[PDB]
Amino acid sequence: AKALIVYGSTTGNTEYTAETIARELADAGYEVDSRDAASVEAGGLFEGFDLVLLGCSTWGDDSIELQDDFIPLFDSLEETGAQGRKVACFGCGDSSYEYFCGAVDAIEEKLKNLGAEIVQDGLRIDGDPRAARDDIVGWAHDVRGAI
Numbered sequence: 001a002k003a004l005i006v007y008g009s010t011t012g013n014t015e016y017t018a019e020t021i022a023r024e025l026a027d028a029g030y031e032v033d034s035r036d037a038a039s040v041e042a043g044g045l046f047e048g049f050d051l052v053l054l055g056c057s058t059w060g061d062d063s064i065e066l067q068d069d070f071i072p073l074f075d076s077l078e079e080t081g082a083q084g085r086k087v088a089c090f091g092c093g094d095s096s097y098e099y100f101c102g103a104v105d106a107i108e109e110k111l112k113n114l115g116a117e118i119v120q121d122g123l124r125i126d127g128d129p130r131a132a133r134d135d136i137v138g139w140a141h142d143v144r145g146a147i
C-alpha cells in the first residue's frame with residue numbers, strides 16, 4: 001500500500017499527530033509520503049495512492065475556520081482524484097469550543113459528495129495530542145485493518 005498523509009498545522013499539534021500516524025504505517029510496511037498542506041498543489045494529488053489521510057486543526061471560535069495552510073487545498077478538493085479513493089480524516093481541536101474539530105466534519109462531508117470512500121470515522125483529538133498518543137496509535141491500526 002502507498003499512503004499519502006497531508007496535514008495543516010499552525011502550532012505543530014496536527015503535525016505531531018500526522019508524524020505519529022506516519023511512523024505506525026511505515027513500521028507496518030506501507031510506503032508513506034507525508035506532506036504539509038503549505039507545500040502541495042492540488043491537481044491529481046491523490047492519484048497513485050491506495051490510502052489518503054487528511055489532517056487539519058479547527059480555528060474560528062464563533063464559526064468554523066480551517067487551518068490556514070489547508071484552505072487552498074480544501075477549495076481545490078475536486079481536482080485531487082478523490083472519487084473512489086479510500087480516505088480517512090484526523091485533526092486537533094478543543095472541546096470547550098462550540099464546533100469541536102468542525103474542520104474534520106467539513107472535510108468528511110465534502111469528501112463524501114466527491115465520492116471518496118471514508119474507511120473510518122475521523123480521529124478528533126481534544127487537547128495536547130502527546131496526551132492521546134495511544135488513541136492515535138489505535139486509530140492508525142483500525143484504518144489499516146479497513147482497507
Ligand SMILES: Cc1cc2nc3c(=O)[nH]c(=O)nc-3n(C[C@H](O)[C@H](O)[C@H](O)COP(=O)(O)O)c2cc1C
Pocket residue numbers: 008009010011012013014015057058059060061062063064065067092093094095097098099100101102127
Ligand atoms: C483562538 C483559537 C480558536 C480556536 N478555535 C477552535 C474551534 O473553533 N474549534 C476547535 O475545536 N478548536 C479550536 N481551537 C483550538 C485548536 O484547534 C487546538 O489548539 C489545536 O491543537 C491546534 O492545532 P494545530 O497546532 O495543529 O494547528 C482554537 C484555538 C485558538 C487559540
